[PDB]
Structure 1
Amino acid sequence: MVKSFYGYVRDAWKNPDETYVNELRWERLQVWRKQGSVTRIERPTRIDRARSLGYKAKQGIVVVRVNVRRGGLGHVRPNRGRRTQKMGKNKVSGGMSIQRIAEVRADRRYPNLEVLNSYWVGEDGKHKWFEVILVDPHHPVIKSDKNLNWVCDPSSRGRATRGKTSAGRKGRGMATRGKGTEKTRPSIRAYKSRGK
């Protein structure tokens, strides 16, 4: 075989708790816990994951690590009249996934960029960590790049907030075609949010 080192990074991260990544995870969550919500990083933790998701080593491509709490939609008990069905909220998790929460927090932190994609990079009993790739549509490098210059279009702005990333489409139910996508494509709002 002649495999790339991206393949080895993939194998190492296939079962991370059974590889050296578990120990690295042990030292590394110590540093990550001390960090805040949204941290810029020089290089992706999983280079092969970043490159397959669209990361390139060029000007205007930023990579960030976002920390998100665990569990479901931390929800308030209603204080007025409700049905019994609508009174309970503890078991009500949201419809917004943790990955998309992290993507949207990164987008909020970086107003001038657009979220491309994100990937899981760690988690503990309280937090999950994601790495979000962002693109600068106003950088000349990105403008020249013909595989990324679609992001300079007026419709590519607000991708993470409008659900246009891969995680957003998965949460919208458009990851598949055919049966089960009757109330999801072309949009959740198009069918009165009855899908999902």
Structure 2
Amino acid sequence: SMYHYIEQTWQNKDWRRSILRKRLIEWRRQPAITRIDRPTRLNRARALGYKAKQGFVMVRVRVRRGGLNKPRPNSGRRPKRMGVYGYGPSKGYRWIAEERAARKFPNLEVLGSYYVAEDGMYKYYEVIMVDYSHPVIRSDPELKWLQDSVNRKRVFRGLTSAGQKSRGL
């Protein structure tokens, strides 16, 4: 399939990593949460459940890498509980990126994510989101589970793929 060859050009250590560097220069200027027209990696999107119907949207999110933005305590602590450096959010940056996308698009449900790039200050992810109220999605037989109100806003309760991994499941 052509999807097998998409993953080969974007694989590991390649001349393609000269093309991808040029994109990053543009991506650093666009807003931190943007809707994009088409997935950058169709192999990753189609495996996670993206289709070419209307109601599927693609969002790119950039976050800031590093550890937790943790302040030094100001009241009295034992020496164990006074340390700052080395802490990272037990939630992954992949799960943090999905959460910020679900804030800006409150009518869509997160289906998956994968990252696309990385530089010295940010990490970039792309999130697959679907509109559960469009009549095209409402009639789909493979997403009939998405008509249950318990299956909405799952990203906030750790029920996505990135959340299951981080819960030790």
Please indicate the TM-score interval, normalised by the length of the shorter structure.
over 0.9
- Whichever residue aligns with residue 14 of structure 2, its letter is E
Equivalent-residue separation in structure 2 for 1:40 and 1:88 (angstroms): 39
Alpha-carbon displacement from aligned partner over 1:6-44 (angstroms, at most 9, x marks no partner):
0001122221x4241x11221101111001111001100
Report the alpha carbon displacement of residue 53 of structure 1 after superposing the two structures with TM: 1.0
RMSD (CA atoms): 1.0
Aligned to 1:150: 145
Alpha-carbon displacement from aligned partner over 1:128-179 (angstroms, at most 9, x marks no partner):
10000011111111111111232221111111111111011001111xxxxx
Aligned to 2:71: 76
- Whichever residue aligns with residue 157 of structure 1, its letter is R
- Whichever residue aligns with residue 52 of structure 2, its letter is A
Aligned to 1:33: 28
- Whichever residue aligns with residue 26 of structure 1, its letter is R
Alpha-carbon displacement from aligned partner over 1:56-95 (angstroms, at most 9, x marks no partner):
1111111000001101111111111112111101211121
Matched, 1:10 2:17: no
- Whichever residue aligns with residue 108 of structure 1, its letter is R
Aligned to 2:95: 100
Q: Secondary structure at the match of 2:91?
A: coil
TM-score of the two chains, using structure 2 as the length reference: 0.96
Q: Secondary structure at the match of 2:141?
A: coil
Q: Across the two proteins, how many residue pairs are aligned to each other? A: 169
Equivalent-residue separation in structure 2 for 1:19 and 1:61 (angstroms): 32
Equivalent-residue separation in structure 2 for 1:116 and 1:19 (angstroms): 31
Structure 2 counterpart of 1:167, from 156, 162, 169 = 162
- Whichever residue aligns with residue 30 of structure 2, its letter is Q
Q: Secondary structure at the match of 1:62?
A: strand
Asked whether the 8 Å contact 1:137–1:149 carries over to 2, the reply is: no
Equivalent-residue separation in structure 2 for 1:99 and 1:26 (angstroms): 21
Q: How do 1:37-56 and structure 2 match up within 5 A?
A: 37-56=32-51
> 5+ unaligned residues in a row in structure 1: which ranges?
175-196
> 5+ unaligned residues in a row in structure 2: which ranges?
none
